[PDB]
Symmetry: C10
Subunit: 74 residues, 10 copies
Amino acid sequence: MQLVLAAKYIGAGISTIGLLGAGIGIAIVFAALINGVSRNPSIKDTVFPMAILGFALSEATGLFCLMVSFLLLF
Amino acid sequence: MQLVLAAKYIGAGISTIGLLGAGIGIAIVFAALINGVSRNPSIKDTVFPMAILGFALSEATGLFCLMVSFLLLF
Amino acid sequence: MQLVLAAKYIGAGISTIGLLGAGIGIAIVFAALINGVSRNPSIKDTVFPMAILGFALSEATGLFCLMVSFLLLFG
Amino acid sequence: MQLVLAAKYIGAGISTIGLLGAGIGIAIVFAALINGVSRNPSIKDTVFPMAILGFALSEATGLFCLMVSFLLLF
Amino acid sequence: MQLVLAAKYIGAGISTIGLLGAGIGIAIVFAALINGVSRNPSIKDTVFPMAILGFALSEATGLFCLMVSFLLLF
Amino acid sequence: MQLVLAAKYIGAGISTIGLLGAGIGIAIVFAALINGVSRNPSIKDTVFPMAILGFALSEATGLFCLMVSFLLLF
Amino acid sequence: MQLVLAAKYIGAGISTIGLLGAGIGIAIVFAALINGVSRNPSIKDTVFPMAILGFALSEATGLFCLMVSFLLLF
Amino acid sequence: MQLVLAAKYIGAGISTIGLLGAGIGIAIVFAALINGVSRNPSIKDTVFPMAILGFALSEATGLFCLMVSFLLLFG
Amino acid sequence: MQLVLAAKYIGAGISTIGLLGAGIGIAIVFAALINGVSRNPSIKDTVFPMAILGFALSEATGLFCLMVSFLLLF
Amino acid sequence: MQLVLAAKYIGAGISTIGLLGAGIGIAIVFAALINGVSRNPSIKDTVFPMAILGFALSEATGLFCLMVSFLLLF
């Protein structure tokens, strides 16, 4: 049991690595939003919902990693 | 039995690392969408479905990783 | 045989890491498609099949990874 | 008990790797803010709250990593 | 002989990591092809063979990884 | 107690990896500052405080890594 | 002798990771070739040998990795 | 005590990995400096001190890594 | 001796990882050369020696890694 | 004594991974040099020393890694 528990904990730590993708990804979406609005302010109401969708989908991948982490911890 | 179970849990954590590619890839697609629409609002109905296809195919690679993760966990 | 089995499962996990390349690559191809069409809408029918070929070739590298993963899991 | 404790401390260290994602992502958001404002100073009041939101969401991913780290440590 | 076999299977999995380089590289080549053709449609016949060559040479690096993988697996 | 101490020192080293995110992110912010000022010198006073804020927030992610490192070291 | 053999096979797998560098690098060279020729078709005969040289030198780095792999295997 | 010593040396090695960030970051700052000056030579005296500050802050992250490395090697 | 030899071999494999930097770096230099010459063919004789220096310096870092590999192997 | 020596050699190999940052960073500097000179040949005497400074400081980070590698080896 102690070896299995040990592995659960190492596994949980490893499972957070993939969240780096969402950290970068969310930023890339928001960077495009800012650059898009700066170049064409009139487009703001069109691209803002696209940014919200983009960030939500990128974030979802990190949440998949976190779910695995929590399953290993709990 | 103990060591094998330990390995499954370590393996499950490692199998989520690949999800970072989808986290970044989804963002790259949505960034291109936002930048393309800002530069040419008239093209939005054409490029929006391309973004959905792009996102889905990128996400599919992360779902393959998750698949292996859940096979190892369960 | 516990050691060998343990190694198969760890190895199977490690074998999925390379799929991040297809995750990023497929996105890069589709981003170029979107930016290309935005800049020159008339080129769509020319570049769309290029993007399909591009995606499929990038994805194949990831499917090689997954193939090794399944060989370790099941073979 | 030594084995589980060992795993907690190694897991806690591994759990910080994902913070590199927020390190880079936060920067990408602020780079976009600076480049967007330099190109179009009049847009500053519009894009600045977008940058705050982008930073916060990217930062959150790194906070989920740190959460797992602190769970493993404490 | 169990330790050696274990090592072969660990080694085989590690040997697939480098395939990420071809996944990204093949995409980079196709991205340039699409962007080049969009900017200058008349150049299509000239640059398409360049893309095929670039793709093949990038893919070859992944195939060297896969070769080592299968040497280790079998 | 030797295994646990070993784990702390391994964990402490692993905990510095995430600092690469701040090394790159701080540079990305300063790169945008330099490029923004080169393109529009009149904007210097506006964007410099944005760069300071972006740098601090990126650096904070590395400082969270270093915090875990020192918790493990001492 | 089992321990040394094990290390040779794990070392051989690790030795292929560096090939991702050539995978990406070769692609970067060919992307530049395609973009340069699309922008200026008349320059093709000048830049094509530059691309062959660039590819070869980037590829060489991956070959040094494969060399170590084959030394460890054989 | 062999195990603890072994761990110090492995840990010291691992602690240098983060220096790749300063390697890349310092370069990024200097590239921006070069491109900024090329595009607008008159801005040189304004942006050169920004690049020095930028490099030094990026490098500090790597020096934190190396600090942990030396603590493990010698402390 | 067998454990030390085992470690030499793992160490050698790990020491090739850093060559990925030269693989990418050499390519980035050659990409700039190609793009520079395409935009301004008249500059070719000026930037070609800069490219040779750039690639040589980037390559040197990979050669440092390879030297460590060889010291561990021989 | 055996395990400690084993660790020094594994540690020495790991300590070269960081050199990839210098491999990439040196290239990024020289790419900017080439692109800046191509766009504005008249600035070459000004930006060339900036490139040398940039390269040296980037290379210094890789030399720090190598330093640790040689301390572990010798």
